[PDB]
Structure 1
Amino acid sequence: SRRRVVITGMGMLSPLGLDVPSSWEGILAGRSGIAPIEHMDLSAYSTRFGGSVKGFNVEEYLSAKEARKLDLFIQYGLAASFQAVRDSGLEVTDANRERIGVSMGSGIGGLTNIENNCRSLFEQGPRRISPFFVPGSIINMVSGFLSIHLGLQGPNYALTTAQTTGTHSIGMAARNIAYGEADVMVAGGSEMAACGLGLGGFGAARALSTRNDEPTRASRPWDRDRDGFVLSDGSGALVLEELEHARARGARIYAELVGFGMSGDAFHMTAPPEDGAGAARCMKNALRDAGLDPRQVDYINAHGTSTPAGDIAEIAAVKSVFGEHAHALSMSSTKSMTGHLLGAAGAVEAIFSVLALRDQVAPPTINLDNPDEGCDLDLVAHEAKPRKIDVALSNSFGFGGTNGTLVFRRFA
Structure 2
Amino acid sequence: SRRRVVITGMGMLSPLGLDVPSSWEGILAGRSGIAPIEHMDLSAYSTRFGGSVKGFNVEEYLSAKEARKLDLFIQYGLAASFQAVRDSGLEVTDANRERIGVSMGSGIGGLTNIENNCRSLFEQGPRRISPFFVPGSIINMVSGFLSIHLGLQGPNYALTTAQTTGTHSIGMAARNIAYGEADVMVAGGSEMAACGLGLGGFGAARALSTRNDEPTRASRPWDRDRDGFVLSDGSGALVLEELEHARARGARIYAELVGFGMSGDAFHMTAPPEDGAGAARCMKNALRDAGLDPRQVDYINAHGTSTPAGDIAEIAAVKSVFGEHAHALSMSSTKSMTGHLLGAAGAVEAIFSVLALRDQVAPPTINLDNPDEGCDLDLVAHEAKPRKIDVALSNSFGFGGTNGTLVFRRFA
TM-score category, normalised to shorter length? over 0.9
Q: CA deviation at 1:276?
A: 0.2
Q: CA deviation at 1:179?
A: 0.1
In structure 1, what is the Cα distance between the partners aligned to 2:166 and 2:339?
Answer: 15
In structure 2, what is the Cα distance between the partners aligned to 1:44 and 1:121?
Answer: 23
Q: Secondary structure at 2:327's aligned position in 1?
A: coil
Cα deviations by residue, 1:106-131 (Å, 9 ceiling, x for unpaired): 00000000000000000000000000
Cα deviations by residue, 1:176-230 (Å, 9 ceiling, x for unpaired): 0000000000000000000010000000000000000000000000000000000
Residue equivalent to 1:287 = 287
Residue equivalent to 2:26 = 26
Q: CA deviation at 1:364?
A: 0.1
In structure 1, what is the Cα distance between the partners aligned to 2:175 and 2:146?
Answer: 20
Q: Secondary structure at 1:76's aligned position in 2?
A: helix
In structure 2, what is the Cα distance between the partners aligned to 1:4 and 1:173?
Answer: 12
In structure 1, what is the Cα distance between the partners aligned to 2:200 and 2:249?
Answer: 49
Q: CA deviation at 1:324?
A: 1.1
In structure 1, what is the Cα distance between the partners aligned to 2:193 and 2:400?
Answer: 19
In structure 2, what is the Cα distance between the partners aligned to 1:196 and 1:266?
Answer: 30
Matches within 5 A, 1:180-199: 180-199=180-199
Q: CA deviation at 1:97?
A: 0.1
Cα deviations by residue, 1:347-393 (Å, 9 ceiling, x for unpaired): 00000000000000000000000000000000000000000000000
In structure 1, what is the Cα distance between the partners aligned to 2:320 and 2:68?
Answer: 49
Q: CA deviation at 1:20?
A: 0.1
In structure 2, what is the Cα distance between the partners aligned to 1:359 and 1:295?
Answer: 21
Residue equivalent to 1:127 = 127
1:299 paired with 2:299, answer yes
Cα deviations by residue, 1:110-169 (Å, 9 ceiling, x for unpaired): 000000000000000000000000000000000000000000000000000000000000
Q: CA deviation at 1:39?
A: 2.6
Q: Any stretches of 5+ residues in structure 1 without a counterpart?
A: none
Cα deviations by residue, 1:278-330 (Å, 9 ceiling, x for unpaired): 00000000000000000000000000000000000000000000001001000
In structure 1, what is the Cα distance between the partners aligned to 2:35 and 2:339?
Answer: 11
In structure 1, what is the Cα distance between the partners aligned to 2:195 and 2:43?
Answer: 13
In structure 2, what is the Cα distance between the partners aligned to 1:397 and 1:90?
Answer: 32
Residue equivalent to 1:277 = 277
Residue equivalent to 1:321 = 321
In structure 2, what is the Cα distance between the partners aligned to 1:115 and 1:307?
Answer: 28
Residue equivalent to 2:214 = 214
Q: Any stretches of 5+ residues in structure 2 without a counterpart?
A: none
Q: Secondary structure at 1:258's aligned position in 2?
A: strand
Cα deviations by residue, 1:36-74 (Å, 9 ceiling, x for unpaired): 000310000000000000000000000000000000000
In structure 1, what is the Cα distance between the partners aligned to 2:24 and 2:371?
Answer: 25
Q: Secondary structure at 1:326's aligned position in 2?
A: helix
In structure 2, what is the Cα distance between the partners aligned to 1:338 and 1:361?
Answer: 18
In structure 1, what is the Cα distance between the partners aligned to 2:29 and 2:264?
Answer: 35
Cα deviations by residue, 1:75-108 (Å, 9 ceiling, x for unpaired): 0000000000000000000000000000000000
In structure 1, what is the Cα distance between the partners aligned to 2:243 and 2:310?
Answer: 36
In structure 1, what is the Cα distance between the partners aligned to 2:39 and 2:116?
Answer: 14
Cα deviations by residue, 1:223-257 (Å, 9 ceiling, x for unpaired): 00000000000000000000000000000000000
In structure 2, what is the Cα distance between the partners aligned to 1:195 and 1:105?
Answer: 19
In structure 2, what is the Cα distance between the partners aligned to 1:148 and 1:367?
Answer: 43
Cα deviations by residue, 1:1-24 (Å, 9 ceiling, x for unpaired): 200000000000000000000000
Q: Secondary structure at 1:41's aligned position in 2?
A: coil
In structure 2, what is the Cα distance between the partners aligned to 1:232 and 1:40?
Answer: 15
Q: CA deviation at 1:342?
A: 0.1
In structure 1, what is the Cα distance between the partners aligned to 2:309 and 2:245?
Answer: 43
In structure 1, what is the Cα distance between the partners aligned to 2:25 and 2:182?
Answer: 33
In structure 1, what is the Cα distance between the partners aligned to 2:305 and 2:272?
Answer: 12
Q: CA deviation at 1:263?
A: 0.1
Q: Secondary structure at 2:309's aligned position in 1?
A: helix
In structure 1, what is the Cα distance between the partners aligned to 2:169 and 2:397?
Answer: 14
In structure 1, what is the Cα distance between the partners aligned to 2:307 and 2:269?
Answer: 15
Q: Secondary structure at 2:78's aligned position in 1?
A: helix
Give the TM-score normalised by structure 2.
1.00
Give the TM-score normalised by structure 1.
1.00
Residue equivalent to 2:268 = 268
1:245 paired with 2:245, answer yes
In structure 2, what is the Cα distance between the partners aligned to 1:190 and 1:397?
Answer: 16
Q: Secondary structure at 1:392's aligned position in 2?
A: strand
In structure 2, what is the Cα distance between the partners aligned to 1:290 and 1:381?
Answer: 29
Q: Secondary structure at 1:73's aligned position in 2?
A: helix
Query: How big is the alpha-carbon RMSD for the aligned residues of Structure 1 and Structure 2?
Result: 0.3
